[PDB]
Specification:
3 copies of one chain form a homotrimer. With 116 residues, chain A is of the alpha/beta class. Chain A is built from 2 helices and 5 strands. Chain A has a 5-stranded mixed sheet with strand order 3-2-4-1-5, with helices on one face. The radius of gyration of chain A is 14 Å and the shape is globular. Chains A, B, C: It is found in: Cytoplasm.
């Protein structure tokens, strides 16, 4: 059984450093919020990056925390004009029997505005 | 076990309203075609939107029908010149033991041209 | 249980033919490297294409080798300036109990530079 976990975080500036730190923070909190003990529980992780972020290497953030063996993919987030700027989103596919209503989705910084 | 479900639908005009209605129609038919009784069966849902659609909020369509707890992600569809215009595509990851050849994929409106 | 499989391959020229052949080669090797006997084992396959590739139809390559019933999705890879050019990436979601450290990820041609 698989459960997707969503995450989102914003960065104040378009720099690789800011993007790296933000991605790392989000990944760690998504793991913490769901009590995930090992990366072996993750089937894969998909990232989306908004068009206002340039040198975005979210994969390197995952690598720094040891997710070397977790398959990662990064795609351009649909560029809706006027949408929340500078956002890194995550969709982690988690092998778990955790009920859908018990999965914890994480929205940080300005990304909290994304959820009602 | 997980089975992906594909869906595709076109819109006649580039407006949030047209995109919303089309997305909703597609999602409902994909669920209906596969006899899905609860959203809890969905691991996650990924959407792709073509570059000729601007204010596309497919996630709001999913929310309107109650998919609040289903993790969603939306990415830009590879923009191949001359390809079918104004398409909203869906890839639903379904937790099921349904045989691959028994999963029903849904193509609506002009999107029927996508499949041979 | 699901395990993602990553693949990446580069093409020397931006033509549909070059993209088709490369995609096919990558898909076949990813299957071969993991001893996959049937496509029925694949939940879905997601492709990302870099912005320097134009008429990219990776789905047709999958179709040619018989993956008609495997749900496919293709999105634009985040366009980081100066990143490795002309890359077709794959993320295959595999229903298997294979340990995460035993899954074989495939990087071909210039894509070998992507992994340390």
């Amino acid at each position: 059984m698989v459960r997707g976990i969503r995450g989102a975080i914003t960065v104040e500036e378009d720099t690789p450093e800011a993007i790296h730190q933000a991605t790392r923070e989000l990944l760690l909190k998504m793991l913490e919020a769901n009590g995930i003990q090992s990366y072996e529980e993750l089937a894969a992780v998909i990232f989306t990056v908004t068009e206002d972020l340039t040198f975005a290497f979210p994969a390197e953030a995952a690598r720094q925390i040891g997710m070397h063996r977790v398959p990662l993919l990064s795609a351009r987030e649909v560029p809706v004009p006027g949408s929340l700027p500078r956002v890194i989103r995550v969709l982690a596919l988690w092998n778990t029997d955790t009920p859908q209503d018990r999965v914890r989705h994480v929205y940080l910084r300005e990304a909290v505005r994304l959820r009602p």
